[PDB]
Amino acid sequence: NVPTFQKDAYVGALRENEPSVTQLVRLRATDEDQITYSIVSASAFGSYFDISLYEGYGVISVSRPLDYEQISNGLIYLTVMAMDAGNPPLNSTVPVTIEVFDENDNPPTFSKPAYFVSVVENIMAGATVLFLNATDLDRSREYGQESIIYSLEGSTQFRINARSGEITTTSLLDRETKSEYILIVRAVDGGVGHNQKTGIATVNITLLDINDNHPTWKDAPYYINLVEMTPPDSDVTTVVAVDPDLGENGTLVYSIQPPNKFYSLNSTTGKIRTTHAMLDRENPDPHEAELMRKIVVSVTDCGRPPLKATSSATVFVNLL
Ligand SMILES: [Ca+2]
Ligand SMILES: [Ca+2]
Ligand SMILES: [Ca+2]
Ligand SMILES: [Ca+2]
Ligand SMILES: [Ca+2]
Ligand code: NA
Known part of the structure; x- marks a missing residue:
């Protein structure tokens, strides 16, 4: 029917x-x-x-x-x-x-081929360096978004979270020995064998400087020989510290402490000269004669707060 x-x-x-x-x-x-x-x-x-x-x-x-x-x-x-x-x-x-x-006919992709991130050098081991986000357009969870596994190549000091793509540190860093890094990030989908597809991006990391170094003295204590009764303004010797931090944080400022009337230095150079106070080798005064032949110098950087050397340094003078 x-x-x-x-x-x-x-x-x-x-x-x-x-x-x-x-x-x-x-x-x-x-x-x-x-x-x-x-x-x-x-x-x-x-x-x-x-x-x-x-x-x-x-x-x-x-x-x-x-x-x-x-x-x-x-x-x-x-x-x-x-x-x-x-x-x-x-x-x-x-x-x-x-x-x-579903066929795996879409690759993981990134918004950019290269990412650029700056970070202070004293970053807390394990903190968020950078969120990354690949996109795979296949609709199924097997071949599309849900299937993405992030991978990271470059420095053992960094590591990526394999599901979320959040990049993180393995340790404390140090601008004074590694300034920059180029890392490669792979996203891969759930395709198998030759049908697995992969997205790539570089991540270029720059370390911003902290004032994390004290000045320290090069070739101290210093020994100079200097003639008796030498004129005012005669060159004496040059003192030197080193701060490997950048700009202001590595800029050195020398001074004589406590003060010494027989000598003056350039605070930016560390170049000691003599003063109008004349150098009598056989001078009565005990105190006055001791600092005729010994100069104590300190040194600070121009950070905020400004750091300074642990020790002072000495110029041992020997009169003639
Ligand atoms: Ca598909
Ligand atoms: Ca399709
Ligand atoms: Ca896919
Ligand atoms: Ca410094
Ligand atoms: Ca530094
Ligand atoms: Na450092």
Whole structure:
């Protein structure tokens, strides 16, 4: 009487990006009394599907490739209708479900090919250097976003979180021995073997200077020989400290402490000269004669707060 399909429901399945497919589904209804099959509904891409009568079966096919990434939930739902040659005609419908399988046809990508980040050199071991974010456009969780594994190459001093891409430190750093780093970041998807795909970006890290070094004396204590009664302004010797920090933090400021009337230095050079106070080698005064032949010098950098050398340094003078 009414065309009745042999099943309550039908099914077919294929990968995305298939050229065509000749038999997603075979259906058949039966009339005791003829039958024409039609696709009456389609959740999506109806135009791509076709039905034909082959050897008594209504046979669904698909003529274009499908894109998994343009389909919600991997499923296309069709409704097929069998209809007799009746006047009026009689019909019956049935659900068909087309599963589309995802292919790994999208690579992980980064917003930029190179990222640039600056960071103070006293960064707390394990702190957030940089959040990274790759994007994989495959829709399935197997091949798309959820599947991304971050990897990091370069210095053992850094490490990346494999799921979130958050980059972090392995240790305390030191601008005074490593100033910059170039790291390579790989994102990879859940494809297997040659179908695994990978995204890449460099991360270029610069260390900003902290005033984390004291001045220290080069070649102290100093020994000079100097003639008796030498004129005012005669060159004596040069003192030197070293601060390997940058700019202000490495800039040195020398001074004589406590004061010494027989000598003056240049605070920016450390170049000691004599004063108008004359150097009598056989001078009565004990105190005055002792600092005639010994100069104590201190040195500070221009940081904030400014650091200074642990020790002072001495110029031992020997008069002639
Ligand atoms: Ca696709
Ligand atoms: Ca895909
Ligand atoms: Ca992918
Ligand atoms: Ca310093
Ligand atoms: Ca420093
Ligand atoms: Na340092």
